[PDB]
Scaffold this active site. Structure first.
Site, PDB file in Angstrom:
ATOM      1  N   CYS A   1      31.323  33.907  33.919  1.00  0.00           N
ATOM      2  CA  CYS A   1      31.400  35.400  34.044  1.00  0.00           C
ATOM      3  C   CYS A   1      32.049  35.933  32.564  1.00  0.00           C
ATOM      4  CB  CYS A   1      32.775  35.284  35.089  1.00  0.00           C
ATOM      5  SG  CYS A   1      34.031  33.910  35.017  1.00  0.00           S
TER       6      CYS A   1
ATOM      7  N   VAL B   1      30.964  39.567  31.286  1.00  0.00           N
ATOM      8  CA  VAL B   1      31.814  40.597  31.227  1.00  0.00           C
ATOM      9  C   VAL B   1      31.559  41.446  29.894  1.00  0.00           C
ATOM     10  CG1 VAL B   1      34.158  41.210  31.039  1.00  0.00           C
ATOM     11  CG2 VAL B   1      33.459  39.917  33.013  1.00  0.00           C
TER      12      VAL B   1
HETATM   13  S1  CLF Z   1      36.635  28.530  31.795  1.00  0.00           S
HETATM   14 FE1  CLF Z   1      38.010  27.495  33.278  1.00  0.00          FE
HETATM   15  S2  CLF Z   1      36.821  27.071  35.227  1.00  0.00           S
HETATM   16 FE2  CLF Z   1      35.405  28.544  33.812  1.00  0.00          FE
HETATM   17  S3  CLF Z   1      35.644  30.798  34.870  1.00  0.00           S
HETATM   18 FE3  CLF Z   1      37.086  30.272  33.010  1.00  0.00          FE
HETATM   19  S4  CLF Z   1      39.027  29.586  33.922  1.00  0.00           S
HETATM   20 FE4  CLF Z   1      37.337  29.447  35.593  1.00  0.00          FE
HETATM   21 FE5  CLF Z   1      35.396  30.146  37.597  1.00  0.00          FE
HETATM   22  S5  CLF Z   1      34.443  31.630  38.700  1.00  0.00           S
HETATM   23 FE6  CLF Z   1      32.854  30.107  38.313  1.00  0.00          FE
HETATM   24  S6  CLF Z   1      34.225  28.346  37.577  1.00  0.00           S
HETATM   25 FE7  CLF Z   1      33.709  29.763  35.535  1.00  0.00          FE
HETATM   26  S7  CLF Z   1      31.930  30.943  36.195  1.00  0.00           S
HETATM   27 FE8  CLF Z   1      33.995  32.098  36.196  1.00  0.00          FE
HETATM   28  S1  SF4 Z   2      34.562  47.772  27.831  1.00  0.00           S
HETATM   29 FE1  SF4 Z   2      36.279  46.781  26.935  1.00  0.00          FE
HETATM   30  S2  SF4 Z   2      37.030  44.857  27.913  1.00  0.00           S
HETATM   31 FE2  SF4 Z   2      34.948  45.541  28.614  1.00  0.00          FE
HETATM   32  S3  SF4 Z   2      33.263  44.232  27.253  1.00  0.00           S
HETATM   33 FE3  SF4 Z   2      33.454  46.453  26.514  1.00  0.00          FE
HETATM   34  S4  SF4 Z   2      35.550  45.991  24.872  1.00  0.00           S
HETATM   35 FE4  SF4 Z   2      35.612  44.293  26.450  1.00  0.00          FE
END
Ligand code: CLF
Ligand code: SF4
Ligand SMILES: Nc1ncnc2c1ncn2[C@@H]1O[C@H](COP(=O)(O)OP(=O)(O)OP(=O)(O)O)[C@@H](O)[C@H]1O
Ligand SMILES: Nc1ncnc2c1ncn2[C@@H]1O[C@H](COP(=O)(O)OP(=O)(O)O)[C@@H](O)[C@H]1O
Ligand code: ICS
Ligand SMILES: [Fe+3]
Ligand SMILES: [Mg+2]
Ligand SMILES: [Mg+2]
Lengths: 477, 271, 522, 271
Positions: free
Chosen positions: C152, C156
């Site tokens: 994720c 993002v």
């Molecule tokens: S390094 Fe650690 S375990 Fe990873 S996300 Fe980040 S806090 Fe969590 Fe979470 S829902 Fe699945 S397991 Fe990841 S891809 Fe995101």
């Molecule tokens: S919109 Fe802002 S928070 Fe989202 S990826 Fe771009 S710089 Fe990062």
């Protein structure tokens, strides 16, 4: 093996990496020398893992939620973010507790915000406030809420501090916001640090003005024991049999009240230095409470720790310590007499996280086995400094070891036993080497204390001398 | 011919307005041009549709709940000259993540099917402060292959143009997206034309058109009717037709190469 | 205290008097716990229907979900290809959690890597991490192909996987001809099955979108089978065995059973079996492509129909009598190979086991949860057994799947008292089983807590759990069982009837009280 | 210690005006700190004699992790002893600048850059402000006074009111307040009356009317600020007056956001 051979094995193993990877990993492998008191001159620790090398390290979310805050039973811990993390970390760690789950205890439960795309695009503050309201509506007997931030929360700049403050002020509840995003740091150690900072800022000083608690000169707190199958309870029974009063357990079977009552104790008994050293130092600096390291892994370490703890008090405590040692001597002597002949001379290779690689060497030596190689997932240079003393000459030390490196190190060493996590258990079981899970105790335990020594010996004997390890070769091959 | 283009530059130089009158001029003699608004401020389609706001992709995604159950026609609409219009949208300023919104809106447009009809132009509009890959999605693969930078003669425009040309090196060395040309929006600066052609040859390119700091645009924006809509016989109308011609018959596009800072320091001395 | 000849683990060691006294002392002195009467009152309230209304009025809190994130399914899909390393672009904690999850479910080694992206990589991007990770993985673990997924954090910030891999190839960190398929697997969209679909679609696109000029449908006289997210090796085995019995050429894409059932003979095999690259390059030449779990293979279906020009049949999951016969008939029609006598004998034997066990299986009320295709197949099979589903739960289902399940229920008289839930979690299911009590629960290992709660209410309110699904952690070697086909139907029927009979035997073991029904013959 | 945040759009003159403001303020004997939340690194380019400086995140990456970075490596003196830092960030089109500014601000808070021995702290933020990372400077224990820099253009009003709407949530949750509007004249027709009316509607106080000129650009080419390029020009005196009045300013009022119909009416009464 000789010292000149461990270095040759290290070089031969490192020969496969590219130039940058080889140069980086050459700093994380060392041949032990107990004379050297500074680990910086031999090994390098607490750096970022090389990409694509199959590391075993975790993230900061693990090191906070599943390690420090999670064992707390009367609180509700929110996995703020996508689902995965909470789900993967649910009930995977055996931090034992006593309580009615779903009513007043929530350790094995998974509370999550379950972020969607609209939550990422528009935010999660309103959703977090609604989630807090529903948590209070549906679980009225909780004694606090913690918000464990998963990666996206840190990225999109969700302001959980203000939400926590406002909802706590309006609902008269202790809501602790924790910034434990996984991409922070390199491993679980920064998660430990962040969780300790959260405890310091939002929980520890709540009862700074309350004086109703009556304090006795024999007040202690167990710091850094998380009750993995009852180890905290096993240590607590020994401590209470000494005449000492334990007020707080951090954090296995711990309650928010114990955390609040901790600043009133006379001595801090720190088991895991790596996880709670920051909070121990803060308590020492702010309240004047001294802290000391103790080890209850095997009879020798347990006896030494009991004597050291009793040395901090008057003569009655020392007399009770002598009484406990005399009472428990025959049991562990019988355990040794039963299991040492079956385990004498065996060689052990270990790869665990921040504390246990050096703490469990004493028990293995008590059972007649030697440790030919130990390693740390995320331990700092101070842990290695303590580790050089406990390990013998010409023994391999590895930090952030890869699956490849560990595989060929085991292939060249041929240890009799390997103690590591679930991500190497089956790899080394299919190689014909007995394996013991040194994190969950292979769903057995406890291993701390005199009671745990018998279980430890039985488990080592059953895993090492099982008839299955002699059956891996077909008679026709 | 499925020509995907994009307008770049820093905010305030007039990227949006420029592409609105550009599409308005394009729509005269038969273009099935579609515009995409990758600006969270929700103004990239303002004049063509004659409505200040509409059902943006993120607003309808939040209302329905998920993008899968969101219809294509609920967010895509046609206006002047059959200019099919759509806008990504995003959160109110100071919260959320607009780049993720741009990413999911562009994926929505791509996977429902919007590049299927004639689509003479798929003009993209981006914001000045490209701070993440979400706002660099319009220049990804199977996307805009011709980037126009709206700039003027002034230090900050040169800095923006240099940074953007640097940013169109990573996506160009591993793709087919190139730089078409530089569009001029005059600030009423001294001997600017020569400075701008100097920049164009400094990057081995050419300047397509120079648009003066006319006051007609600010009058057309308050009545929210583009100059083509305003009247088909204005001076800017003819100028925007010239812009349309020189943007449809363009053949020059080269991989940008960042230039040194000394020229930025001593440009004013030369001019 | 411990006796050396009889050593006690935590249970029942902590049931001793000294440990009990110390626990009580600690509780009373320092825990500040609520009084036991208040705890009992709160539990009883949570077992009520007003609490059920409050629970179902939830809008932002999810308690004990029944789903995971996309990269888990992406890794499971990547594991099914020959000498293929699952690569996850993002944070290392995600990979550690995936590996622990799969190790606990399969009790097998699971190979997966990450680029270990940090804060600086989150701010400046993961180009250098991608380059170095690809180079290091290829140099160290020497795979034939690297399949890239995402966490994720990368999704993002909008990491360009295509551009990153192209630049990695262009600067010499990997050979230009080395196969590196990639897929976007955002964890805030869908679930693990969506990740499996995305990864398979990405791999299929990578090996077949640029070479469709010399492809003709039906050239190789084979049938492509896409199994989807599957955690039972028996399903792969039974599909292959059935298609071999029918004498039908098949190319099962993403077959991971070999790497998840490696033998223990002294050597560690990182890679074993798997779908070959030549099989996927020749995939468009097959007569048709059949999807075993269509309800989470929508993107794959769209890509196959759009590019490979394969008329994918509208088939349900091969679960139970009717759907297994439909699958076999569709395969026979596509290939022209008649259904042999062995499959007919197997179907007859399964119908005879149903006839034998119908007297105990009829009228039983079941609560179930899991994946969409798996849940709908289980519901169908329960309908053919005369059982009554009451609560159907699918945390990752949508409105269309709910409509299909509702139509299936309305087609049968045993679905009269059945309601379907989408987007709910296991707390909702606990409320349901407390308010509308079913006889049994069919699900993964997470229902043992619901069983614990029901037992705490009382022995007459206990809802036993039957473990069929993913993940199962508290039992050993249950991943080797079969769910699809006639064989899987026999296995499920035997499990259900034996669970009912075991519960009946437990309820009638009381001497001089309830042993009048402790019959030898059942 | 006074913590101030400068908001607006890009290209209006946010940085420029802020840098001359703090230079003049230091000339009066004030210990001031500039924290540049601009990933372009252009907020301290006239006080620091360094051409590109040594940004917080770039040295965090060069040091492995942020925790290994000390305050002395990124916090350097400029003209008049002005402490300044740069958050840094990625090249445009990749990464996440919001996380960059978040990490820089958390780093500054961790090692106590606010030593209570200074007077003013000015945050230079991004104009677009499309995520919470750039809204971090306006949180609790952060900048309390916000000065929105606006220009004569109507989109300057649009961005100003959208920014004010974004501020509203933090003002309600916390204690951050809108201080006023520094309006940079663009040599338009009677803009000052319109800006006065907008401030009156918002309830704030228009700060000053620094006009459009050329000595600021010629001072930039010298690579320092306006005030100490030629302490004499009228613009230097106006900047000093701006410093004095922001010193003695005490009116802090929550913004009241207006709709686009309202803004159309303000455009109507002054065409
Ligand atoms: S390094 Fe650690 S375990 Fe990873 S996300 Fe980040 S806090 Fe969590 Fe979470 S829902 Fe699945 S397991 Fe990841 S891809 Fe995101
Ligand atoms: S919109 Fe802002 S928070 Fe989202 S990826 Fe771009 S710089 Fe990062
Ligand atoms: N040729 C022109 N002459 C004068 N004014 C113009 C001209 N073209 C556009 N304008 C005006 O200049 C302003 C340009 O602002 P606009 O919002 O279009 O810029 P932008 O680059 O899209 O900004 P952002 O990226 O911040 O959204 C508007 O007031 C517009 O009407
Ligand atoms: N009062 C002014 N008169 C004329 N030009 C100005 C004035 N203030 C700033 N500028 C110029 O405006 C341009 C943009 O200002 P700057 O602060 O760099 O932009 P931003 O608002 O994006 O931070 C610069 O070239 C600057 O010299
Ligand atoms: S907390 Fe730490 S990895 Fe100190 S994260 Fe880890 S229950 Fe290990 S070596 Mo699992 S620093 Fe505890 C640990 Fe040690 S989870 Fe347990 S066994 S003594
Ligand atoms: Fe196994
Ligand atoms: Mg614009
Ligand atoms: Mg600026």
């Amino acid at each position: 093996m000789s010292r000149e051979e461990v270095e040759s094995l290290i070089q031969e193993v490192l020969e496969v990496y590219p130039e940058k990877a080889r140069k980086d990993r050459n700093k994380h492998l060392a041949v032990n020398d107990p004379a050297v008191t500074q680990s910086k001159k031999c090994i390098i620790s607490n750096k970022k893992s090389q990409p694509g090398l199959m590391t075993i390290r975790g993230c900061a979310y693990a090191g906070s939620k599943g390690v420090v805050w999670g064992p707390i039973k009367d609180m509700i811990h929110i996995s703020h973010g996508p689902v995965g993390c909470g789900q993967y970390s649910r009930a995977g760690r055996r931090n034992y507790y006593i309580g009615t789950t779903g009513v007043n205890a929530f350790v094995t439960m998974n509370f999550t915000s379950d972020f969607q795309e609209k939550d990422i695009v528009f935010g999660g503050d309103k959703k977090l406030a609604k989630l807090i309201d529903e948590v209070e509506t549906l679980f009225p007997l909780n004694k606090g809420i913690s918000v464990q931030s998963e990666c996206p929360i840190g990225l999109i700049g969700d302001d959980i501090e203000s939400v926590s403050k406002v909802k706590g002020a309006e609902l008269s509840k202790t809501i602790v916001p924790v910034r434990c995003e996984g991409f922070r740091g390199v491993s679980q150690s920064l998660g430990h640090h962040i969780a300790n900072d959260a405890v310091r800022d939002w929980v520890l000083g709540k009862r700074d003005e309350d004086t109703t608690f009556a304090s006795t000169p024999y007040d202690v707190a167990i710091i850094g024991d998380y009750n993995i199958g009852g180890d905290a309870w096993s240590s607590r029974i020994l401590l209470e049999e000494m005449g000492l009063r334990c007020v707080a357990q951090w954090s296995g079977d711990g309650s928010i009240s114990e955390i609040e009552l901790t600043p009133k104790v006379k001595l801090n008994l720190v088991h895991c230095y790596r996880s709670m050293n920051y909070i121990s130092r803060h308590m020492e600096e702010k309240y004047g409470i001294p802290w000391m390291e103790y080890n209850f892994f095997g009879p020798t370490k347990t006896i030494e720790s009991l004597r050291a703890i009793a040395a901090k008090f008057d003569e009655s405590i020392q007399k009770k310590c002598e009484e406990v040692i005399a009472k428990y001597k025959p049991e562990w002597e019988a355990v040794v007499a039963k299991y040492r002949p079956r385990l004498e001379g065996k060689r052990v290779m270990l790869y665990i996280g921040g504390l246990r690689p050096r703490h469990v060497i004493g028990a293995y030596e008590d059972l007649g086995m030697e440790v030919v190689g130990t390693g740390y997932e995320f331990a700092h240079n101070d842990d290695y400094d303590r580790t050089m003393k406990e390990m013998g000459d010409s023994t391999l030390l590895y930090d952030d070891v890869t699956g490849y490196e560990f595989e060929e190190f085991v292939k060249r060493i041929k240890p009799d036993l390997i103690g590591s996590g679930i991500k190497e258990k089956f790899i080394f079981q299919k190689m014909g080497i007995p394996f013991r899970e040194m994190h969950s105790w292979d769903y057995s335990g406890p291993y701390h204390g005199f009671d745990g020594f018998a279980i430890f010996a039985r488990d080592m004997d059953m895993t090492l001398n099982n008839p299955c390890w002699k059956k891996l070769q077909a008679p026709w091959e | 011919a499925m020509r995907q283009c994009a307008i770049y530059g820093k905010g305030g130089i007039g990227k949006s307005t420029t592409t609105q009158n550009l599409v308005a001029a394009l729509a005269e003699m038969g273009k099935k041009v579609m515009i995409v608004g990758c600006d969270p401020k929700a103004d990239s389609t303002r004049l063509i549709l004659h409505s200040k706001a509409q059902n943006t992709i993120m607003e309808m995604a939040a209302e329905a709940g998920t993008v899968e159950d969101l219809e294509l026609e609920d967010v895509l609409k046609a206006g002047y000259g059959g200019v099919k219009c759509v806008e990504s949208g995003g959160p109110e300023p100071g919260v959320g993540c607009a780049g993720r919104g741009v990413i999911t809106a562009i994926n929505f447009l791509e996977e429902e099917g919007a590049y299927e009809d004639d689509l003479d132009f798929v003009f993209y509009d981006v914001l000045g402060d490209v701070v993440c890959g979400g706002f660099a999605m319009p220049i990804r693969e199977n996307k805009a292959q011709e980037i126009y930078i709206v700039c003027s003669g002034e230090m900050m425009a040169m800095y923006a143009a240099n940074n953007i040309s640097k940013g169109i090196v990573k996506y160009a060395n591993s793709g087919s997206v190139r730089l078409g040309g530089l569009i001029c929006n005059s600030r009423n600066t001294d001997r600017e034309d020569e400075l701008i052609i100097a920049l164009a040859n400094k990057l081995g390119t050419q300047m397509i058109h120079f648009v003066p700091r006319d006051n007609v645009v600010q009058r057309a924006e308050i009545r929210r009717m583009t100059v083509i809509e305003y009247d088909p016989k204005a001076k800017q109308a003819d100028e925007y037709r010239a812009l349309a011609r020189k943007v449809v018959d363009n053949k020059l596009l080269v991989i940008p190469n960042p230039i040194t800072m000394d020229e930025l320091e001593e440009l004013l001395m030369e001019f | 205290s411990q006796q050396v000849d009889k050593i006690k683990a935590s249970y029942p060691l902590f049931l001793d008097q000294d440990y009990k006294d110390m626990l009580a002392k600690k509780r009373d002195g320092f825990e500040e716990k609520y009084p036991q009467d208040k705890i009992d009152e709160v539990f009883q309230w949570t077992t009520t229907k007003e609490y059920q209304e409050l629970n179902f009025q939830r809008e932002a809190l999810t308690v004990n979900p029944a789903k995971a994130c996309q990269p888990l399914g992406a890794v499971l899909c990547a594991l099914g290809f020959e000498k293929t390393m699952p690569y996850v672009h993002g944070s290392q904690g995600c990979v550690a959690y995936f590996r622990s999850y799969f190790n606990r479910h399969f009790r097998e080694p699971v190979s997966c890597v990450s680029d270990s992206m940090t804060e600086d990589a989150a701010v400046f991007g993961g180009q250098q991490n991608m380059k170095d990770g690809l180079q290091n993985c290829k140099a160290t673990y020497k795979p034939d192909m690297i399949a890239v997924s995402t966490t994720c954090m990368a999704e993002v910030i909008g990491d360009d996987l295509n551009a990153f891999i192209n630049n990695s190839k262009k600067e010499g960190f990997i050979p230009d001809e080395f196969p590196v398929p990639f897929a976007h697997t955002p964890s805030f969209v869908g679930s693990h099955v969506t990740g499996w679909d995305n990864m398979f679609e990405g791999i299929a696109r990578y090996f077949t979108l640029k070479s469709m000029d010399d492809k003709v449908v039906g050239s190789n006289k084979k049938i492509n089978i896409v199994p989807g997210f599957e955690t039972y090796l028996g399903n792969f085995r039974v599909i292959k065995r059935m298609l071999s019995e029918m004498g039908v050429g098949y190319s099962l894409l993403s077959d991971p059973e070999e790497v998840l059932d490696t033998p223990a003979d002294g050597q560690f095999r990182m890679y074993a079996g798997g779908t070959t690259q030549e099989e996927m390059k020749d995939a468009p030449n097959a007569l048709n492509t059949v999807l075993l779990q269509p309800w989470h293979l929508e993107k794959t279906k769209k890509f196959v129909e759009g590019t490979w020009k394969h008329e994918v049949p509208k088939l349900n999951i091969p679960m139970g009598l009717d759907w297994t016969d439909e699958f076999l008939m569709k395969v026979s029609e596509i290939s022209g190979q008649p259904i042999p006598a062995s499959l007919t004998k197997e179907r007859g034997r399964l119908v005879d086991m149903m006839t034998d066990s119908h007297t105990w299986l009829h009228g039983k009320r079941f609560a179930l949860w899991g994946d969409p295709d798996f849940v709908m197949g289980l519901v169908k099979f329960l309908l053919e057994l005369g059982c009554e589903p009451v609560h159907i739960l699918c945390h990752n289902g949508n409105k269309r799947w709910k409509k299909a399940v509702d139509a299936i229920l309305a087609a049968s008289p045993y679905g009269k008292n059945a309601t379907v839930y989408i987007g709910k979690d296991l707390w909702h299911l606990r409320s349901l089983v407390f308010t509308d009590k079913p006889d049994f629960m069919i699900g993964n290992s997470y229902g043992k807590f619901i069983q614990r709660d029901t037992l705490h209410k009382g022995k007459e309110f206990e809802v036993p759990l039957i473990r069929i699904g993913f993940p199962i952690f508290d039992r050993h070697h249950l991943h080797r069982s079969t769910t699809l086909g006639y064989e899987g139907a026999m296995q499920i029927l035997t499990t259900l009837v034996n669970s009912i009979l075991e519960r009946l035997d437990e309820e009638t073991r009381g001497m001089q009280a309830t042993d009048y029904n402790h019959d030898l013959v059942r």
